[PDB]
Amino acid sequence: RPTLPIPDLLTTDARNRIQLTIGAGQSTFGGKTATTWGYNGNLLGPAVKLQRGKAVTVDIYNQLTEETTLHWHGLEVPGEVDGGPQGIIPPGGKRSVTLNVDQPAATCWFHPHQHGKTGRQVAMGLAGLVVIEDDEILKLMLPKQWGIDDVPVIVQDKKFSADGQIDYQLDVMTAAVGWFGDTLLTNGAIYPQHAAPRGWLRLRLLNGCNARSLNFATSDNRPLYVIASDGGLLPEPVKVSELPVLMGERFEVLVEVNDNKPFDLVTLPVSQMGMAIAPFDKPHPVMRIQPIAISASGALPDTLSSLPALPSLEGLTVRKLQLSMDPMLDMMGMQMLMEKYGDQAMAGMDFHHANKINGQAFDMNKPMFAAAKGQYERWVISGVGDMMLHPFHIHGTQFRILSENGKPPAAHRAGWKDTVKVEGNVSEVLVKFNHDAPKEHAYMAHCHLLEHEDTGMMLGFTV
């Protein structure tokens, strides 16, 4: 098996700057070369390392021949640097943003947010990681040797043409159910192996799929110890046998490497339209882990962090966000799926503006509302009226989930989150915005099934 590629850990220079170049190159997948896009490379991108309380300047060079934007998913930053659809970087052009990092240690990420083209641009290869550290997490003595016992694991599906090229389309089927493929990549590689020291192994898991939800486990059912969600450390580890992960979510887990036997990280079949088609109808390997006897000192602590209590609900502003899809899209989309795959498509169970929030397809010129600054609000996000999956992402914030799709959040989902599950039911988040966003550089809130977002399931808001 190819060894697991490790994104380079990219830190500030002597002048407190970092450079990111967005460009096209070539990658090879199962023998065939394909045109791919990457940050500082051909595919995917580096892990940008930031420290809480320290400002960095990022110089972004768009070396594509089309426009793009750069969104820091999970970062509590002003709208001006948030890199939503209004953050255009012209082809051949350079844009610089200042990130004044002020949030707990977390694994966040970054990716394009081009208006109507976000799905395509991510599918082409654009994504990178953000490793935020603070004064608290380094006290914990977690595994910390980057690319040895502290390893990013970015999992993504793709579909390829006969000629080997990435086979991406925004059409009626994908507008409805998403873009998904038959080939699983792990940091850009197909079924790689990673050499992990005996002791504790830390995985920073990112579901970087456009539309595919995942569910991590191990081939021999050894447990995962969840230590962190989107926006950082949980209060204490949560021990699980499997870990569902929605599109754009991150969890950090420890896994015990307590003998010499190789095992796989795997993903288990999910109940989502289109996602349990072969070979995802069965547990699917993600990467092979090969235990090795080299130095490690990482441990699993009893106690990780202390988070604030949930705010009192009395007197909070309530915002209702109703998600919907044009009936025609739903049936048309389903028709194409059934035509393409047949009964397998339901196993485990103008379209360009057919996806909506509060009866409106995204209008870039009209923020739906102004949210309060520095005050908790309760946002109620409903998917009642359809049975599609919607990982709902709110920019500019790490929030607390009050209810997820009908129930209190699972323990490992009760900490800091930038995404909440909405699937035929209603969710509630308690959300606070510590930074401003004007109408000209508004925050986005949207489904992170990218083809839904691209076809209207998004709103802008100011702070």
Is 352 known as a binding-site position?
A: no
Please identify, among the stretches 229-237, 272-280, 392-400, 416-424, the one whose residues bind Na ion according to the rule CB under 5 A.
Answer: 229-237
414 binds, among Cu ion, Na ion, none (CB under 5 to 8 A by kind): none
Is 435 known as a binding-site position?
A: no
How would you list the strands of the sheet with 232-240, edge to edge?
Answer: 189-190, 183-186, 150-158, 199-207, 250-257, 224-229, 232-240
Q: Please state, in angstroms and rounded to a whole number, the distance separating the CA atoms of residues 189 and 124.
A: 14
Confirm if 75 and 108 have CB atoms less than 8 A apart: yes
Which lies closer to Cu ion via its Cβ, residue 155 or residue 447?
Answer: 447
314 binds, among Cu ion, Na ion, none (CB under 5 to 8 A by kind): none
Is 452 known as a binding-site position?
A: yes
**Which one of residues 77, 154, 449, 463 is an interface residue with Cu ion (CB under 5 A)?**
449
**Which one of residues 47, 217, 452, 455 is an interface residue with Cu ion (CB under 5 A)?**
452
Is 115 known as a binding-site position?
A: no
449 binds, among Na ion, Cu ion, none (CB under 5 to 8 A by kind): Cu ion
Q: In the complex, what is the shortest distance from the CB of residue 309 to Na ion, in angstroms, rounded to a whole number? A: 17
Query: Total residues contacting Na ion (rule CB under 5 A)?
Result: 3
Is 448 known as a binding-site position?
A: yes
Which lies closer to Na ion via its Cβ, residue 227 or residue 337?
Answer: 227
Confirm if 368 and 357 have CB atoms less than 8 A apart: yes
Rg (alpha carbons) of the chain, rounded to whole number? 21
Residue 447 structure tokens: 């489904």
Residue of minimal CB distance from Na ion? 236
**Residue 447 touching Cu ion (CB under 5 A):** yes
Please identify, among the stretches 70-78, 194-202, 291-299, 365-373, the one whose residues bind Cu ion according to the rule CB under 5 A.
Answer: 70-78
Confirm if 129 and 45 have CB atoms less than 8 A apart: yes
**Which one of residues 80, 167, 236, 377 is an interface residue with Na ion (CB under 5 A)?**
236
390 binds, among Na ion, Cu ion, none (CB under 5 to 8 A by kind): Cu ion
Please identify, among the stretches 73-81, 135-143, 165-173, 271-279, the one whose residues bind Cu ion according to the rule CB under 5 A.
Answer: 73-81
Which residues within the stretch 398-417 sit at the binding site for Na ion (CB under 5 A)?
A: none
250 binds, among Na ion, Cu ion, none (CB under 5 to 8 A by kind): none
Confirm if 1 and 191 have CB atoms less than 8 A apart: yes
236 binds, among Na ion, Cu ion, none (CB under 5 to 8 A by kind): Na ion
**Residue 307 touching Na ion (CB under 5 A):** no
284 binds, among Na ion, Cu ion, none (CB under 5 to 8 A by kind): none
Q: Which of 92, 11, 9 is nearest to 56 (CA)?
A: 11
347-380: buried (b, 16+ CB within 10 Å) or exposed (e) per residue? beeebebbbbbeeebbeeeebbeebeeeebbbbe
Q: Which of 67, 52, 143, 153 is nearest to 109 (CA)?
A: 153
Q: Please state, in angstroms and rounded to a whole number, the distance separating the CA atoms of residues 375 and 9.
A: 35
Q: What is the DSSP string of 426-460?
A: EEEEEE---S---GGG-EEEEESSHHHHHTT-EEE
Could you give the dihedral angle defined by the CA atoms of residues 64, 68, 74 and 76, in that order, rounded to the nearest 10 degrees?
Answer: 120
Which residues within the stretch 263-302 sit at the binding site for Na ion (CB under 5 A)?
A: 302
Q: Please state, in angstroms and rounded to a whole number, the distance separating the CA atoms of residues 419 and 269.
A: 21
Please identify, among the stretches 200-208, 265-273, 363-371, 394-402, the one whose residues bind Cu ion according to the rule CB under 5 A.
Answer: 394-402
Q: Binding site, residues? A: 71, 73, 111, 113, 390, 393, 395, 446-448, 452
Binding residues for Na ion, rule: CB under 5 A, are 236, 302-303
Binding-site residue positions for Cu cation: 71, 73, 111, 113, 390, 393, 395, 446-448, 452
Positions in the binding site for Cu ion (CB under 5 A): 73, 390, 395, 447, 449, 452
